[PDB]
A paper describes a structure:
α-Actinin-2 (ACTN2) is the only muscle isoform of α-actinin expressed in cardiac muscle. All four isoforms of α-actinin consist of an N-terminal actin binding domain (ABD) comprising two calponin homology (CH) domains, connected via a flexible linker, which allows for conformational flexibility in the ABDs, to a rod domain. Thus ACTN2 is important in cross-linking actin and titin filaments in the Z-disc. We have investigated the effects of two mutations identified from HCM patients, A119T and G111V, on the secondary and tertiary structure of a purified actin binding domain (ABD) of ACTN2 by circular dichroism and X-ray crystallography, and show small but distinct changes for both mutations.
In the closed conformation that we observed, there is extensive contact between the CH1 and CH2 domains, and the residues Arg243 and Trp145 stack together, as found for other ACTN ABDs. From our structures of the other WT and the two mutants that do not have this N-terminus helix, this may suggest that the N-terminus is highly flexible. The measured Kd for the WT construct of 7.5 μM, is comparable to that measured for other ACTN ABDs [∼1 μM for smooth muscle ACTN (ACTN1), and 5 μM for Acanthamoeba ACTN].
Residue numbers in the entry: 19 to 257
The structure:
């Protein structure tokens, strides 16, 4: 059988940029909450398949108890646990499309990422409201107001606007000028600018280093779900 197939099989071990980014960011986001429950996940495509840490995540971020988990390794107990996590998200206003317990238990990557995004959106971004603007659009207007003074920043979206890292440094500088010497930063060191903001955010604001920096700089259009997840932590930290 052909060498050509074998080489392309190996090539499937590279995740597309959008997955790398969502994987890194949504894993760190889940972990910055699960640590209040004394646990962590390591691999987002594997560690929600039994429904247990998913139910716990939902409890930690909602503050409300979910019904008791099924105990037992049998596959229908994992299905019952994930159904409880998804029924709880539904009950909180999220209309789920193309997402079901069966594919989550089977490790479906796009579906598992999509589910976690619906959680991040509902419990971190949905209720953001600035000047009669809610959710994604409200978080964006917020970023625009905070960064308006900064002439080397133009927040117009949750992707390309954020590539050079200056948008992140400005959000910090506006709220905490003591923490950053903004005037010394420029557009030629985007990787530096990103890792700097993330290092400052981690040390002083308790926000883990969620972003895939290399991919943000090098990908034509960064993943906006990942960037919204990270920026949503700055909003909660500053408001």
């Amino acid at each position: 059988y052909m060498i050509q197939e074998e080489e392309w099989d190996r090539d499937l071990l590279l995740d597309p940029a959008w997955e790398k980014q969502q994987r890194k960011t949504f894993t760190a986001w889940c972990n910055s909450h699960l640590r209040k429950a004394g646990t962590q996940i390591e691999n987002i495509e594997e560690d929600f398949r039994n429904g247990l840490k998913l139910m716990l995540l939902l409890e930690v971020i909602s503050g409300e108890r979910l019904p008791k988990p099924d105990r037992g390794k049998m596959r229908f107990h994992k299905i019952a646990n994930v159904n409880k996590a998804l029924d709880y998200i539904a009950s909180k206003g999220v209309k789920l499309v193309s997402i079901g317990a069966e594919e989550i238990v089977d490790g479906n990557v796009k579906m598992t990422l999509g589910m976690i995004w619906t959680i991040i959106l509902r419990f971190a971004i949905q209720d953001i409201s600035v000047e009669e603007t809610s959710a994604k659009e409200g978080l964006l207007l917020w970023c625009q107001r905070k960064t308006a003074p900064y002439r080397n920043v133009n927040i117009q979206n949750f992707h390309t606007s954020w590539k050079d890292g200056l948008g992140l440094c400005a959000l910090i500088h506006r709220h905490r000028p003591d923490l950053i010497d903004y005037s010394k930063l420029n557009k030629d060191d985007p990787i530096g600018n990103i890792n700097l903001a993330m290092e400052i955010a981690e040390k002083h604001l308790d926000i883990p280093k969620m972003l895939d920096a290399e991919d943000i700089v090098n990908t034509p259009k960064p993943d906006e779900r990942a960037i919204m997840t990270y920026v949503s932590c700055f909003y909660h930290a500053f408001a």
